[PDB]
């Protein structure tokens, strides 16, 4: 019943959003919740946030 089939491959780059689910190795899963700008993150006295 089929005469010809055409297949197309799409490549996508899923980047990251508030809502993804990243987890550690000790079963401490969690849903990422915000993407803060770097100037708001805690930073130690050396300057590395």
């Amino acid at each position: 019943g089929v005469l010809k089939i055409v297949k197309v491959y799409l490549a996508v780059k899923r980047r990251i959003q508030p809502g993804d689910k990243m987890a550690g190795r000790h079963g401490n899963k969690g849903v990422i919740s915000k993407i803060n700008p770097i100037e708001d993150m805690p930073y130690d006295e050396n300057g590395t946030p």
Binding site: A11, R15, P37, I38, E39, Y43, E45, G47, T48
Partner: protein, 224 residues
């Protein structure tokens, strides 16, 4: 009382190529932290930088393919290119050209630099050609921007590849308040801003830029 010493720039010590220190003095009590924090947020937030935006390789249609002769894929070439450091004097949008043939690494120094565009780290690597007669020719596009701009959210032929922009010279900013010694006074501070840029921005220019932006945006409160 009811009068405040005004700060000043005492010395811009250049400890290394990309690591710098700025000293501000004098400062009344309670301003050390205020100015330190304001300037840190401003500097990390918005400094005008320059970065590569579009690449156009000769014999490649999309970034997921491979080219015969080069060692890495095209994705790793784009990634390595994304971290390129370059300054442009007058033009807000320039086009560099790279041509290479022969075995070896392809440093940024092989870019056919124009008069005004300046590469800051001529030992940065891009790819490894592994054949005596394998060549690469590409046309890099460099723009001037003010932050982060992902490829998706901006706004033709099938030969253009789009990389994400990261226009920000500064990378890490720290600071310290410490008592100084004016002719005679107690509780007189001195601010030290430690800066680690990627080499494309002059320190004093950056600090003056932050000061002017903060002031001229604070102007909206006076005569409200």
């Amino acid at each position: 009382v009811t009068e405040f010493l005004k700060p000043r720039l005492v010395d811009i010590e250049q400890v290394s190529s990309t690591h710098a220190k700025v000293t501000l003095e004098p400062l009344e009590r309670g301003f050390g932290h205020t100015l330190g924090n304001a300037l840190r947020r401003i500097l990390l937030s918005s400094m005008p930088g320059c970065a590569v935006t579009e690449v156009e390789i000769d014999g490649v249609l999309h970034e997921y393919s491979t080219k015969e002769g080069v060692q890495e894929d095209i994705l790793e070439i784009l990634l390595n290119l994304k971290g390129l450091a370059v300054r442009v004097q007058g033009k807000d949008e320039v086009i560099l050209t790279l041509n290479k043939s022969g075995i070896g690494p392809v440093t940024a120094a092989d870019i056919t630099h124009d008069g005004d565009v300046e590469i800051v780290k001529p030992q940065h690597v891009i790819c490894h050609l592994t054949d005596e007669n394998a060549s690469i020719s590409m046309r890099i596009k460099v723009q001037r921007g003010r932050g982060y701009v992902p490829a998706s959210t901006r706004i033709r032929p099938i030969g253009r590849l789009l990389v994400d922009a990261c226009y920000s010279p500064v990378e890490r900013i720290a600071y310290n308040v410490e008592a100084a010694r004016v002719e005679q006074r107690t509780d007189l501070d001195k601010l030290v801003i430690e800066m680690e840029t990627n080499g494309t921005i002059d320190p004093e220019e950056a600090i003056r830029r932050a000061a002017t932006i903060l002031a001229e945006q604070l102007e909206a409160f006076v005569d409200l």
